[PDB]
């Protein structure tokens, strides 16, 4: 995986925390997985906002947490 | 206008001597009326393709003057390739026969 | 003004600038060797310089 965390602003990720759950498709079979938004929000404490990439829509984590 | 590349290719085939033998063989059992009708039909097919496809399609050369610019360019190409070449030859001819401007000289004074 | 005519000087005009876009390239390019390496086998250089590898 990459160190590219999407900005949770609605201009980038519409409807991030409107509901308490996130979902993802996994693998070639695209298995479903549901994740709590708090488990996800733990990442944005390690996110560094000086760094912004890919049209300034993705921030970077600190290397300690990412690794 | 369209298919200029195909027209160049047609001229190349026509100037090829192998194609002359091929045409000699194809002319067996054939009439001048048939040949003329075939050529006329080909030209009509080209112009009809234009008349139909211009209604909905645009070529890479499309411009605010349309096919007028392409036809002008065809004319200018013909002019510079054929007529100016003939003019060069006529100029050298007149210059060798009378001198430069010899065809516009005044009559001998009486 | 006999000896003062070769003293009227004018500077050159060449600009040594050329942009270097390497983002366009992804392959290496060859490069010349300009001088022989004397930092290695210095003592033997007159004795092996005439041979070709």
């Amino acid at each position: 995986m990459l160190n590219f965390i999407p900005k949770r602003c609605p201009s980038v990720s519409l409807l991030f925390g409107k509901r308490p759950v996130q979902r993802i498709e996994v693998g070639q079979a695209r298995h479903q997985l549901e994740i709590p938004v708090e488990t996800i929000e733990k990442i944005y404490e390690g996110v560094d906002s000086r760094l912004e990439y890919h049209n300034k829509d993705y921030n970077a984590m600190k290397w300690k947490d990412f690794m | 206008g369209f298919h200029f590349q195909q027209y160049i290719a047609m001229a190349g085939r026509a100037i090829n001597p192998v194609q002359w033998t091929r045409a000699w063989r194809r002319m067996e059992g054939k009439s001048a009326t048939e040949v003329y009708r075939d050529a006329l039909a080909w030209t009509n097919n080209q112009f009809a393709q234009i008349s139909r496809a211009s209604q909905y399609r645009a070529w890479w050369w499309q411009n605010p003057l349309g096919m007028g610019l392409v036809l002008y360019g065809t004319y200018k190409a013909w002019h510079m390739i054929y007529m100016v070449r003939k003019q060069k030859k006529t100029a050298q001819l007149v210059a060798a026969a009378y001198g430069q401007g010899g065809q516009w000289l005044n009559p001998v004074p009486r | 003004l006999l000896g003062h005519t070769t003293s009227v000087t004018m500077g050159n005009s060449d600009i040594f600038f050329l942009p270097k876009p390497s983002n366009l390239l992804k392959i290496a390019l060859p490069a010349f060797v300009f001088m022989p390496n004397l930092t290695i086998f210095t003592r033997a250089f007159p004795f092996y310089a005439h041979t070709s590898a």
Binding site: M1, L2, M67 | - | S22, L25, K26, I27, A28
Partner: protein
Amino acid sequence: GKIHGAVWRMKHLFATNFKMVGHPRYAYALPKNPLLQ
């Protein structure tokens, strides 16, 4: 250009592996897996 090509291949071949957190020659320095036994 050589460096560009090298990094451009490193991206595709390292960034999505899940097996290359670093280079294998330095795996001695990693912490140990609690799940292996």
